[PDB]
């Protein structure tokens, strides 16, 4: 009556690899899609071969939680036609994917602004995970209570009328 797997957070990213006007417009479309101000993902160091701007914005991401996150995930499954590969699900229970042309979601687009990709990541947890996240009396969650690949596969396949690949 307590082992109810539920969505904790969703991390959404853009796949462009470039900063500037493209990144600013990527941040704007992320804000429109999520309703929240982004955080510009930074580069921790510079590489001579690539010339990545050190300590400067390279990517953007937000984290959505609750019913709005579930609705966004449902929309992400709508474009993904509810088809996914078993490799997407890690041994820790997290699952994610990535689709280009985010125009497949519920938003109007134009070529002048540009086209940007969209990658979704979902962190799965069960009630009682606050033990490993609270400041005081922090502990380790039990092995049976931890999220595994088979558990998140069964949870995903139970609803959404979705299927996985036969790998």
């Amino acid at each position: 009556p307590m082992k109810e797997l539920r969505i904790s957070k969703l991390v959404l990213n853009i796949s462009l690899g470039e900063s500037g006007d493209r990144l600013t417009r990527a941040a704007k479309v992320l804000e429109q899609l999520s309703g929240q101000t982004p955080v510009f993902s930074k580069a921790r160091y510079t590489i001579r071969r690539f010339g990545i701007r050190r300590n400067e914005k390279i990517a953007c991401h937000v984290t959505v939680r609750g019913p709005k996150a579930e609705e966004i995930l449902e929309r992400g499954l709508k474009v993904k036609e509810y088809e996914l590969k078993k490799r997407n699900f890690s041994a820790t229970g997290n699952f994610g994917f990535g689709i280009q042309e985010h125009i497949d979601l519920g938003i109007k687009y134009d070529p002048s602004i540009g086209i940007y990709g969209m990658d979704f990541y979902v962190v799965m947890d069960r009630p009682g995970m606050r033990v490993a996240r609270r400041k005081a009396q922090r502990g380790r969650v039990g092995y049976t209570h931890k999220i595994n690949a088979e558990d998140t596969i069964n949870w995903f396949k139970q609803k959404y009328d979705a299927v996985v690949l036969g790998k």
Binding site: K135, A136, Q137, R138, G139
Partner: protein, 287 residues
Amino acid sequence: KSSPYFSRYQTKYRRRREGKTDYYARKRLIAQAKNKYNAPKYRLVVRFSNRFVTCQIVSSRVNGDYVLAHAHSSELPRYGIKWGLANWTAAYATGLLVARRALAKVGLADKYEGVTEPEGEFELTEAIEDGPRPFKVFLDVGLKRTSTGSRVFGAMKGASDGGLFIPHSPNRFPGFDIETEELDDETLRKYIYGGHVAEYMEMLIDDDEERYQKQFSGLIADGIESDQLEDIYAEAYAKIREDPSFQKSGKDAAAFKAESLKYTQRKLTAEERKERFNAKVIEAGRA
């Protein structure tokens, strides 16, 4: 996670491993100047569970800690606070209760009364021109983050109004201004007398009736309006001041001892372990 890793592993302190004691802050909390010799340093330890508030006055020795005065929010219903035992006002009430009990134990209750009515004004309990100094206690918040309007400082304000000399600044009290560095007595009185709770009742009556039924079920069971909270809190403070004595419950601990052993387990003996080892070997089908 190998055998050499386990051998070289050095465990932290037991309370550090279970995440209960901050020894970095504790060392500075209990460290008397060596030229003051055996003068104890008293801490007002304030802890908050999900339902209750624990306030203690602790003096530390080599063998362990000693509690001088105890005040639990579960004792508030004796004075009249039966609804709400883990909020800012309850922390204030139990801080007042522990202050009065400590002053009674040290024989300073009649000499230091603090403030009778809490008007939400920053006022450290001062000493008399020719008389003993007020009992000095230092706040101990544990691992709770010290933010403005925190319940730890709420209990500290209650103890300070009780009479305990707790050195503090009017910075973390609820309603303090970060720009003009000013403390508003209106919101301090609101938090002291639970006016913020009463405002929450009014907001939930205005809209989202089902949420109000779901949340404040305890208050509705007794049928309490939001306007009576200030009366109840003020009367409870007066009753606490009039009679702060702790009632030592006389319930039979022997029965609790007996019932606890009923479900208490026991370790296996050496001969039983050997018999089970033999049984497992036989059951393995390889003997």
